[PDB]
């Protein structure tokens, strides 16, 4: 019953490649990603207003 | 082409690192309570 006592917290957000490339050194291992598969249509758990 | 996703690679120099499966297991354990709660909000 306390937010501070929580061990973990997980959030899902929409992002594009340009956002990740804004900070190139921050993110590693970008080439292996399959961009086409990871779309709001393919993820049913994410709740969004994008058509 | 098509490099294999989930090809293991050590990102950091920590003695013990998390790896993806631990985090996904935590998410799948925590999900049932969240799903039960969301019904009331809906």
């Amino acid at each position: 019953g306390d937010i501070n006592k929580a061990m973990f917290a997980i959030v899902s957000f929409e992002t594009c490649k340009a956002d990740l490339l804004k900070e190139k050194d921050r993110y590693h291992n970008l080439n292996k990603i399959d961009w086409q598969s990871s779309a709001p249509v393919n993820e049913p758990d994410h709740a969004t207003t994008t058509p | 082409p098509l490099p294999d996703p989930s090809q293991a690679t050590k990102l950091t120099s920590w003695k013990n690192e998390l790896s993806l499966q631990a985090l996904k297991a935590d998410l799948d354990a925590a999900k049932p309570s969240h799903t039960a709660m969301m019904i009331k909000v809906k």
């Binding site: 393919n42 049913p44 | 799903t35 809906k42």
Partner: peptide
């Protein structure tokens, strides 16, 4: 008289290997 769970069972999308290979030319 029977509680109805909401989250329904959904199947994923079949993986496709031949389409990524092909290049596209505009007509």
């Amino acid at each position: 008289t029977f509680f109805w769970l909401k989250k329904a069972i959904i199947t994923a999308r079949k993986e496709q290997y031949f389409m990524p290979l092909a290049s596209v030319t505009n007509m």
